[PDB]
Amino acid sequence: SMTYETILVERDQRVGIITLNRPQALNALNSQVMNEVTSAATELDDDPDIGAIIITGSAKAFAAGADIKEMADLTFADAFTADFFATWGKLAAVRTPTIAAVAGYALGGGCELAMMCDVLIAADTAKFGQPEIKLGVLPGMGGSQRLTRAIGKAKAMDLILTGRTMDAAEAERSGLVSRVVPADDLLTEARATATTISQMSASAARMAKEAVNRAFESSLSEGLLYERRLFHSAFATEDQSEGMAAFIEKRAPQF
Amino acid sequence: MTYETILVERDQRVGIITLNRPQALNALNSQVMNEVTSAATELDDDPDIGAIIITGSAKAFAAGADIKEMADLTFADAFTADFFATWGKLAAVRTPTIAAVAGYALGGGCELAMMCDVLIAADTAKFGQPEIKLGVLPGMGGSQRLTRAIGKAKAMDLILTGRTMDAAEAERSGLVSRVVPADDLLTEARATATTISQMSASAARMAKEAVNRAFESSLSEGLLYERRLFHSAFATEDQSEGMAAFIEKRAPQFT
Amino acid sequence: MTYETILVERDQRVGIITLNRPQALNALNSQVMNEVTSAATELDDDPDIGAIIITGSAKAFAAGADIKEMADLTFADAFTADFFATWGKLAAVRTPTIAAVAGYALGGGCELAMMCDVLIAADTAKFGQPEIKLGVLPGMGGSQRLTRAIGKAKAMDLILTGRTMDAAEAERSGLVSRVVPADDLLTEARATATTISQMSASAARMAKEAVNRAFESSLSEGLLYERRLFHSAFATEDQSEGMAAFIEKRAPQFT
């Protein structure tokens, strides 16, 4: 069953939407959000009727940081024993394409959540940052890894060491976001994008996303070989036949 | 010397390979693949060539791939032939290569452009990977090279939705070296090719090889490799010449 | 220590290294390499320093490594000395470094800037890797750091042609953190340095190190490394203080 305390979930067509729902805390991420979001994403992933997954917050904040109260008295013993934050890894293991729709504050864990998704659509109001340094820690949800890989060392060092924010426009030309859309149009644009992707062959889309993810896990030489073999294997799927046949017959595919 | 799908011109120390299938918008197929790599190799081995341009028409650099060769392809066939692997001969070219890209560079075409070292784009250039729409995925390194060029967010967007990207976006995203007016594309490409071909051959070959290392190993290994190459250059006449010329406040004469 | 080629000053928790060969536009010779790395190491080891700035004159950050010194090299001198390897000492510096670049940052100068964590550019700054055309190639990590920063197409362009990149192009390409007016460069860098040095020293060191991992291994390994480092920060006083301060809406007192 799909009822959660900190999030809302809507299934429409082949698109699933995970809305962060903690207005009282500006959508701050806590242990329960981690567990609810990953559980939801995972269920949507196993659902053969779902072809794209959106993660979003409110117009005010995608997710403005984390509950510092959960972390405040945590010791290294509790941290190592619980493997604090490791559960977020379950989001990255989702095979179906994911879309972060980001309005307002995407800070700390919030910025890192956005970066875990495959596609990142931002409102013009979106503000990205990693202020963990200010709290005497550092990013714990992959920020030092994905940010640096997206925007380059100079900018990632700047944000992570000073804690400054980056607005939608800068994020777009720096490599962080896919596209910037007007604040009022965010949810509509994200659903439109999610629709397009969810209407692709589920198999082909899963493979493409997988191939892209390899670009960060090995040398180019190995990524090229992996992509080529995956490509070869797609010719064993019926969706490639239907897809190419649809192209020839100049029609919509029926996967 | 005579090719069915391409034209080859030599001008001084610059070789130019021009895709030549107007009737098909310079779409790639097995023949184009065999001919381009055959021509490029041959130019690579010619001591009187120091730079190679690959270009298409003003409307299409290469508008995609031939759907015919893929429509009834089985996994067994693709695996046995190692379909597309031959494009790897282009990467093995030691001499610097310049893709001069006008108009359409889609699917395989976009991938062809990404294989070159330098990419000069007409202001008319459109890039994209529409493989997903046909129920397959990039098979010529697109998911590897695009992602490394322009970051995850935008590569995922392009590869999963098939959306096009104009020349200006490509320039600020990391995909292209420079954007020039369409009428000036070929002229500008030859100027660049001329410049590169008049550098020391061995030094340009070491420089290209070093840059290529950046995608094949850790930074600490890449650093060691570059430094060793750099040291090696001191066993060439061209380094002594180039450095004497700076000190003597003159133009170098590489031989 | 007394230095012949640099100037060092300490102010609060900020150390500043000024390249001081004005007669050679701060060309980077072996003596500069040794002194900069010695000064940086000394500053790194001083518990009263929390950030380090490296800068040149308003006319040049550094206009290449010293060509006169290099003309005097055989392959044997270079291999035996492991020419340029000592610059690695600067990468071993745990404390955050900020390159404040005005005017010329060419070859070794551009490379030195890229070695630093944060890069602040005057609007007047010019970047380049013109080593080619001395009949050599970058020897201080240029082929590695530039390529990872700005993508293949532009790094090949710059490295094979020797063309210059203005500060504005560098900022949108991935090379620089921020661009500021030439008159405000030293002021802006000091502000950034101050911000960074007033952070928890251990947090900053961890964060910087985490970010540096993004170039040394796969994403999955970088992710794990970060999380372990994040857990270990909960064994530090500063984590406890940094977070208690935030909850209590006050200013942190790091020890």
Ligand SMILES: CC(=O)CC(=O)SCCNC(=O)CCNC(=O)[C@H](O)C(C)(C)COP(=O)(O)OP(=O)(O)OC[C@H]1O[C@@H](n2cnc3c(N)ncnc32)[C@H](O)[C@@H]1OP(=O)(O)O
């Ligand atoms: C580690 C690596 O990867 C390898 C190295 O970086 S390769 C270094 C390659 N460097 C370059 O090609 C450019 C070097 N410098 C220049 O081209 C020019 O100085 C410039 C374009 C930066 C501006 O020149 P300018 O404003 O007209 O003044 P200019 O007269 O050239 O320089 C002033 C003095 O500093 C010297 N100088 C400038 N750059 C130098 C360098 N990289 N090495 C040794 N001396 C240098 C000049 O020779 C001159 O002194 P002398 O006439 O007495 O010999």
